[model samples]
Target: GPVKKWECEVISNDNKATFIKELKLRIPEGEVVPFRAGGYIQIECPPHKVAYADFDVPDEYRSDWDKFNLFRYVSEVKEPTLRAYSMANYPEEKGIIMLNVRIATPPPKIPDAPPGIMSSYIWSLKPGDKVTISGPFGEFFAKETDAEMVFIGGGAGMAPMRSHIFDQLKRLHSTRKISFWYGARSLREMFYDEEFEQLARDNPNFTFHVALSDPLPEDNWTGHTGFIHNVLYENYLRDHPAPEDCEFYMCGPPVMNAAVIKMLKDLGVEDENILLDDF
Candidate 1:
């Protein structure tokens, strides 16, 4: 139950409908922060409380469930309390953190039907809001930088990869090649499009590919179509070199990550080379 202090502020608040807000925090000077990827900060939602729970599964499968359960527990601890969200910002920016929150919807008018606790609270915050945060907790992290890196993410799954990308860029390590395969429902659901494109344009060693699963009739989505895993199999694994010297990192919905891992293994990538994180 230890805590760290961060000077936090609301920097951007553009997405009102989806209840997405961006916050930046300035860590005190000379604070030696630990390096973390796919880790989460525990926020103490004032006028609300939070809690945690455990489930039976492999650590990987349990990661996402733990996150969901944590939010639920928080709500249960404090009735009518505001909900907490997973930070969307990358790790490299240690001081500043950002989160994308969807306000929770109350349960329908039915007996014994529980409303979503955290979601409801998160959706209600406005700009200039302040909250307390705790540990950079979680075990899902990349171990070494010696291998070639391939990252696949969608929606909020982009958080960890974005951190890794910036870290690699900052270090300017040319020996390792990194590619990102991002999937989204369509253009509207896509975030950080310009940022990734610019990163690829600026760094020849970096490659970013986007796949849209369900495009509208007039969307003119000419890029990769179909499931992201399918595109990775047809375009990347079949056409590119073997992944023996590389590591594959997948973060997204459970189903997509499972499918992509299967595709990679079928293409001769070793099980050890495949990595996954979900929350």
Candidate 2:
């Protein structure tokens, strides 16, 4: 069957500070579109114009926007309809798409720039907001194998990883070893830790590892600290036998993905054994 566009209505929005939000979108047409656990959807961003005065920016930036003809950049992109976001929930759940979205803001160097065009647009959506979404796309999925499974992700990159984990542990009830290594800058950024912890407790074969690269003094934290890849390497991969037999699924920043993928390859893990979505 061909892919069809569906009009989805926002059921709820769970905001976790400025960094992230979880949105539940439901199809109102009484149609069930079953998607694979690790698949993604392309949301249609409504047509709009980018204005420098609309954003909180410096005087120089506003001037540069005009002087550099920034609007030309926006105008050049024609009829952009799709913005990709992965499903955070497992496939067993019906009629809803759960998206763990990160609100993308400008970096310090580009402080005057507006936030991400698509992310900020999605963040502003309210319950009952209508959106057109298309396709359950992508090939980033856990293979059906007896080999050990490891999921590594940070921030909103947790979307696809969460889908795979819940599907493997809760839906399939697999006995294979499953591990998730999550990274964040601070305690506040570590969303869904308690849920993953509860899941870990229920399944003895499942383990959840969390690391904070920079914990605040007020966080009063006691846990692993450092880049997640380094922590994963030091704590698990360095000691594990038959590393090539294990399957690694990762979703994070390009830097983390590149480093971890490179590291895994150097450890003799086959290219097919390592999976990721670069969307």
Candidate 3:
């Protein structure tokens, strides 16, 4: 067996209070790596250790693997630490991997539990620093089927849904319908607004709905304003595809996820059709 190695460089380091770096890696000829849109990979950071990274399976790699594999670092750090996060970057793009990480700041003299490790380390990486990652682990993922899809995400949960939306558009599978309902606290918390807008414009079959849970008095928020579940129930669930025809994918804060699932079940949405990835 032969292994292909790439000397990647950091191209971008700007993220919203998060440590997001884009690495450009070149794969040699005669070596091919196979991964799906939601698949993950491993990066060996060497003497320091190894971390697991998942691929967004961007457009370039959607139908081929020789181009590039875009990955995101989704693990937490602690003393002898490990954590996981959802993949955020789309596979269609090349030369970059994006990750949304929450830096953990612990006060001096904590309680019995240890402080958050992996998150703090990730936040400390400089622009030129390198880290190792591996895998596209996970069993359930958004599949390209005829079933109408509804995505409900909050916070960093947007990772997987982003990948799914791009996949739908690239295939141009107009027969199947898709909608995304994203929840955020304020305008500044929102990401990928323009990209999703363009997705709606390009794919007539796709629609995106954003909801703000807590808007400042002057935020001038005109979009759906309420908990994500309420918006979904009031807008789409009432009139769109029946439970038997639609599949629900939800990932976000544990509280939000629980509340939304309960509402869906009460609305006669079968448990089987409802999928959850609370990473």
Candidate 4:
């Protein structure tokens, strides 16, 4: 399908560095272009500013650029960057799009890459601001079924996994068993703890777990502590449902995803039974 255009407003923005923003755009009562669980949208940015400088530019480099135009040293630039982000929303919901984002910081040392262009632009946006977006793009999605499902994710990966869970719950009505294992540094990074807790209370078949890799001092924590995949592996996959009968969904940081997928494979989970969308 061709991309559709919408000018959405920033309705809510929280957790700036580790943030989840909700954008809202009204759709005519029956004119919603539905998106699936793991679908994403493309945000168009023309000549936006990057979050920081990539490196120090010498004034004597010559030309406005490339050397042909001498003395061309510059301070900033007009870079046009386009990014696709998974929509953390229900399949049929057209009015709201929730995007969980983490601002990437520069490494410690000289010659540092600036924060992401799209991420910075998004972070800088104020409520009521209009943003141009297109989409419902991505084949990563879910099918309606009454099977054992496990979702493992971290950071922004939560978007698609959450979408699938929400959609499944809306469709299946607690008839299926689903577990979600999310990992972060600490509870502060577990942005939707309350939401998932509420969901678990609302539906007995759904369970959510959070694993912290590192907890800061002064934080009294007594939950699962370790890599998310390791925790899930030791606790849930000890001996249970047939791996072939159960379906697995994974998305998140590349390292975490790689480790988890490998763990699942080693545990005898067939290739076809695993769904992955790592970024």
- Please provide, for model 4 over 1-279, each residue's C-alpha lDDT reduced to its tens digit, 9 standing for 90 to 100: 567977666776555123334334443345564677788888777675432232222332212223332112122238666788887777666667777655443433622455456766665566676777787688777755677999998888888888888887875465788999998886656766788899899999999999988875645778899899999987888777675677899988889889999998888888978889975
Candidate 3 vs candidate 4: the lDDT winner is: 4
Each model's lDDT comes to 0.62, 0.80, 0.61, 0.70
Candidate 1 local lDDT, 1-279, one digit each (tens): 556645454454444222223334444455633546556665554555323231112343344445544324333433333223445555556666666544333333442344455543443344565555556566566657677788998656766777667667655455478889988776655667788889888888888888888876776888998889998777777767666678888888778888888888877888788878766
lDDT for model 1:
0.62
**TM values, all candidates:** 0.75, 0.85, 0.74, 0.83
Tell me the number of clashing residue pairs for each predicted model.
6, 0, 27, 7
User: How well is each residue in 187-246 modelled by candidate 2, as lDDT tens digits?
Assistant: 867777888999999999999998899988988989899999899999999999888999
Clashing pairs in 2: none
Alpha carbon lDDT at 263, candidate 4: 90
Best-fitting candidate, scored by lDDT: 2
Residue 91 displacement (Å), model 3 = 2.9
* lDDT-superior candidate, 2 or 3: 2
Best by TM-score: 2
RMSD of each: 8.7, 5.8, 9.7, 8.4
Per-residue alpha-carbon lDDT of model 3 for 1-279, expressed as tens digits? Answer: 434343433444334412222233322233333334444444443223323232222342233222222122233432343355444555654444555554343433543233345654554355566654444455547765788888888776776777667766774455578889998877656778898999899788889999888876777888888899989989878776576568898877788899899999888888888888876
Rate residue 85 of model 4 by lDDT.
83
lDDT of 3: 0.61
| Order by TM-score, highest first | 2, 4, 1, 3
Model 4 spans with C-alpha error above 4 angstroms? 16-31, 50-79, 92-94, 107-111
